[PDB]
Each structure stands twice: as structure tokens, then as C-alpha cells.
Amino acid sequence: GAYNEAKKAAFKPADVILDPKTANPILLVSEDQRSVQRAKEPQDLPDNPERFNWHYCVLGCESFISGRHYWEVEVGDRKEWHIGVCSKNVQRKGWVKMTPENGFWTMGLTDGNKYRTLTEPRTNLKLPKPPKKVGVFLDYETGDISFYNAVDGSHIHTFLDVSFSEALYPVFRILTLEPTALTICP
């Protein structure tokens, strides 16, 4: 409603571009670097330090170190996805649990209709109607990372008062093979 729109007025629209050097080798980044798909099996890519080698993750190219920013992700009719923000300084090699304590502030969908935070423990989110487009808001100085349905402005989750000192990236994760990609709205 009017509340989420005038919120949007106070946050700078970020132009998020996926970074192919960060993407786990099971992921494909599109030619326009706005969408991500999965491959049936891993591609042959370098194990460069930037790359997630266990988690099925990819980062934006640009990080945030101050200010208020937002971007929007077309999740569409996908059955599975997770999105949010992570530290520049997360562990990219080997497994770490994707939780706030490890520098991941994410939420998403599993099995078509189970929305959750990747808080520790996870928290189940009851969304009266499924989002097609998710708005992600970052306020670096307050420490808030929030998720909204970008069409009706309805709130999905906020991580409040996080203690940020680090650069933060947009992060995206997909586990499934589906016909619909995960796509950044410009």
C-alpha cells in the first residue's frame, strides 16, 4: 500500500547484476547477468577464491558499505528459491550453515508453498498469497534487511538491528530444476 511505496521513496534502487565468478558450478548466469538457472550437473569452471564450491549460491557484482538500498527479484511461479544478503567475508569453500551468525540474512521458499527464514532455528512464514516479485530492502545504518511482496507491498520478514561492519552482497540460491529462472527485476 501507500506505506511500502513511500518506504521505497527513501531507499536507493540498486541495479543488481549477478557475478558469474561467484556462482557455484551448478549454476548458469544468463547473458544479461540478471537471471540464474541450474544445470543438470556441474560445469567445468575454475575453483577461484570468489566462487561458492558447496552452496548453490551466486552473489551480485557490487557490495554495500553504507546507505539504504533496494532491489526486486522475480521469483514468479518457481517452487524453490532463497534470496537475501550475505557478508563479503562469508566462508565460500566447504559447508557452513546459512544463518545470520555465519553472515547470511536470507529467506525463501521450498516445496512450492513452505516459506521460511533461514534464521536459526528457521521460522515458518505464512503468506496469505504467494509473491511473484520480492522486494529486498537494506538499511545499512539501522541494520535492517527486509523482504516485501513488491506488488502489494505486504511484509514478508525483517531481520532487525543487525550489527553490520562488513561489505554486504545480494545473494541468490536455487536448488531445483524448473522451467522458470530466478530473475532480478531492473
Side-chain angles (χ1 to χ4, degrees):
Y3 191 82
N4 185 73
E5 216 61 25
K7 194 157 191 295
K8 259 148 76 185
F11 284 72
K12 175 185 210 42
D15 171 40
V16 180
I17 296 167
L18 297 174
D19 187 346
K21 294 191 297 97
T22 68
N24 183 289
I26 203 71
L27 300 178
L28 310 127
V29 174
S30 63
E31 182 61 21
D32 62 13
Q33 298 177 222
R34 300 293 193 154
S35 295
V36 63
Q37 259 294 1
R38 230 204 68 178
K40 295 195 158 255
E41 63 199 324
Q43 299 160 278
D44 178 45
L45 290 175
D47 190 41
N48 53 294
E50 304 84 2
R51 196 178 304 287
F52 286 91
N53 77 355
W54 177 274
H55 279 305
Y56 286 14
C57 293
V58 54
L59 303 182
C61 291
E62 295 154 298
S63 61
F64 305 106
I65 61 178
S66 66
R68 285 185 130 197
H69 304 273
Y70 85 100
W71 58 99
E72 295 186 355
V73 181
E74 189 175 342
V75 300
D77 60 18
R78 282 190 59 83
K79 307 296 194 171
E80 191 277 346
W81 46 264
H82 294 75
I83 65 178
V85 173
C86 70
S87 174
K88 174 171 185 82
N89 311 105
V90 296
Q91 182 181 315
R92 306 186 195 199
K93 308 299 184 182
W95 179 86
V96 67
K97 201 175 179 175
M98 287 182 46
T99 62
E101 168 156 17
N102 293 302
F104 298 87
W105 300 270
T106 63
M107 61 74 56
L109 177 59
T110 199
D111 307 309
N113 70 355
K114 291 197 211 168
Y115 295 95
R116 75 271 180 60
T117 63
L118 296 188
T119 48
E120 176 51 70
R122 280 68 176 93
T123 307
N124 295 331
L125 301 173
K126 170 248 162 56
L127 302 187
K129 278 271 189 275
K132 305 297 157 179
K133 186 165 290 211
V134 176
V136 187
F137 295 65
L138 171 60
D139 186 322
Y140 195 100
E141 289 70 38
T142 63
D144 294 343
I145 299 173
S146 53
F147 303 82
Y148 287 88
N149 180 317
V151 185
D152 68 358
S154 58
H155 186 263
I156 295 168
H157 183 64
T158 297
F159 293 96
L160 291 167
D161 194 40
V162 180
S163 294
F164 301 137
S165 41
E166 291 163 349
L168 306 173
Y169 283 101
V171 64
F172 310 81
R173 190 183 85 180
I174 55 167
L175 299 188
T176 54
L177 290 157
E178 308 187 34
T180 298
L182 184 58
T183 299
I184 295 156
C185 318

